[PDB]
């Protein structure tokens, strides 16, 4: 009675992993809401996070190729103390280091004197030198081009023809499971590739409430990503009127360094309010209690030691990589100012062999910045769920980008299908 009828253009899809376009090529966005659908999402199996990670690494590596190498500056340094007025907390933090640098001429050196942060130098004992640059015994140092900025620029990931991106609009979406309010887009919204290690800055806020996302909430080896519904503002500054000088080290190689600091030296601090931070932590704890016992005491603590790039909270305020100390922020059991250390020679992500030198920017650097999320890690159930301790632990950078790509899934369109009809060909 019934016959096979072939249809082409069937609105069905399968989960798939394909290559996405990076648009910024400004797209004309479209969004089609899908009525009466349910789609299973899994933010921790989303290939878009791995592809975004690879794209950011490739763009970063490409940006540093046509730039000045600092190979001739891997020389011994004669470092002494800074003669300006400093406080007790900054004793030994900044050093005045002299060295012999090359010039455009191959057989004519030049004495130089430059201020360096203590974190950027390592002791090395010789008759006339005291320190060397931290990375010169591990890898070449490449100077970032001063014409190229670091500041995140929102980008869009776009599926190729034959593929589509599904967006989950459900409130209180925990990152996995079914989603009912699902729409189809060709390109994602503008996602800022913001680089941070403990707090998520300039990201997306939750529509309804604080959302706690974990691949396995009972596995203490996985990170917990907390998205806030309200932002908490961070005011960061390096209160030092830095005077930047430069020297020519090769035929086309110009090197930039700290020349001097005008006036007294004061430390580099980020201010977060106390009323809103206390409300934020109360909300986070209230949401945590829904994944643990209702009478379990939840306490926050300082991060563990080891690997300064992880133990501190990074930004890219101005053009200078801060590294703040959240120990005074999470020291509570359920304003505020954070001493931030400055480095210039940065090994970003967890790579070894590619060292980038961030040149200083003249003047003061002050930036205000929305905190939109947190990365928390649990210490472990050593008390049998009597008391739980959470720390602002670090993790791979994928966790920050996943915190934006959790709403998107890539699906492959399958235009063909078959179905019974009474239609017989002849």
């Amino acid at each position: 009675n019934l016959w096979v009828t072939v249809y082409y253009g069937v609105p069905v899809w399968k989960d798939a992993e394909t290559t996405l376009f990076c648009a910024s090529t400004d797209p004309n966005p479209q969004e089609i809401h899908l009525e009466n659908v349910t789609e299973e999402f899994n933010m921790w199996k989303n290939n878009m996070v791995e592809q975004m990670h690879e794209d950011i690494i490739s763009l970063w590596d490409q940006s540093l190729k046509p730039c000045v190498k600092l190979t001739p500056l891997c020389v011994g340094l004669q470092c002494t103390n800074v003669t300006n007025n400093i406080t007790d907390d900054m004793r030994g933090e900044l050093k005045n280091c002299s060295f012999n640098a090359t010039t455009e001429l191959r057989n004519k050196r030049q004495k130089v004197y430059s201020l360096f942060y203590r974190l950027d130098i390592v002791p090395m004992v010789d008759l006339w030198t005291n320190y060397r640059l931290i990375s010169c015994n591990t890898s070449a140092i490449t100077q970032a081009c001063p014409k190229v900025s670091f500041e995140p620029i929102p980008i869009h990931y776009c599926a190729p023809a034959g593929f589509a991106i599904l967006k989950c609009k459900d409130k209180k979406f925990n990152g996995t499971g079914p989603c009912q309010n699902v729409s189809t887009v060709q390109c994602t919204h503008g996602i800022k590739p913001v680089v941070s290690t403990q707090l998520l800055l300039n990201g997306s806020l939750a529509e309804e409430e604080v959302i706690i996302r974990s691949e396995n909430i009972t596995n203490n080896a996985k990170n917990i990503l907390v998205q806030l519904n309200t932002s908490v503002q961070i005011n960061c500054t390096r209160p030092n009127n830095n005077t930047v000088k430069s020297i020519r080290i090769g035929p086309g190689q110009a090197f930039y360094y700290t020349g001097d600091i005008i006036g007294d030296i004061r430390q580099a601090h980020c201010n977060v309010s106390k009323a809103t931070w206390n409300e934020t932590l109360g909300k986070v704890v209230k949401q945590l209690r829904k994944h643990f016992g209702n009478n379990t005491i939840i306490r926050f603590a300082q991060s563990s030691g080891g690997d300064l790039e992880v133990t501190t909270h990074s930004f890219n305020c101005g053009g200078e990589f801060f590294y703040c100390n959240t120990s005074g922020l999470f020291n509570s059991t359920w304003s505020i100012t954070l001493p931030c250390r400055i480095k210039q020679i940065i090994n970003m992500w967890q790579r070894i062999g590619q060292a980038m030198y961030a040149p200083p920017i003249q003047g003061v650097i002050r930036c205000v910045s929305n905190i939109t999320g947190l990365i928390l890690t649990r210490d472990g159930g050593s008390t049998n769920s009597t008391t739980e301790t959470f720390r602002p632990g670090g993790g791979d950078m994928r966790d920050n980008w996943r915190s934006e790509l959790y709403k998107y899934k890539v699906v492959k369109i399958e235009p063909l299908g078959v179905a019974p009809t009474r239609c017989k060909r002849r």
Binding site: L2, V4, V6, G9, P11, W13, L34, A161, G417, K424
Partner: protein, 120 residues
């Protein structure tokens, strides 16, 4: 008027009215790989329709009868009470048998038409 995949959650007998909306939306190294794979997927689907004798059509009727072992349902529940996604899931791993039957039926039809057109 619903847009691309707008009918995806609608019933099969309603979503079948929007086949042109889906069809029109099917068309540096990474960008070329994405464009070439989209072209290859389109061309494989078009060649597969051509092998079945359905070239140039979006709704193509054939001479393969429906087996009750593939889906023991009536037309009302298939077309009016379920979506194409649920149907596609229901007949998963039965499509290769259907495709083979469609290929063989078209080969037999082409031979029969050639023999009919060979009569003086």
């Amino acid at each position: 008027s619903l847009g691309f995949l707008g009918a995806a959650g609608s019933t099969m007998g309603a979503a079948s009215m929007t086949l042109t909306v889906q069809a029109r939306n099917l068309l540096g190294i990474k960008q070329l790989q994405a464009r070439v794979l989209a072209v290859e997927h389109y061309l494989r689907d078009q060649q597969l329709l051509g092998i079945w004798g359905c070239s140039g059509k979006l709704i193509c009727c054939t001479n393969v009868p429906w087996n009750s072992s593939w889906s023991n349902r009536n037309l009302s529940e298939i077309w009016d009470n379920m979506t194409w996604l649920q149907w596609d899931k229901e007949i998963s791993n039965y499509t290769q048998i259907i495709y083979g039957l469609l290929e063989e039926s078209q080969n037999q039809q082409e031979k029969n038409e050639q023999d009919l057109l060979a009569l003086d």
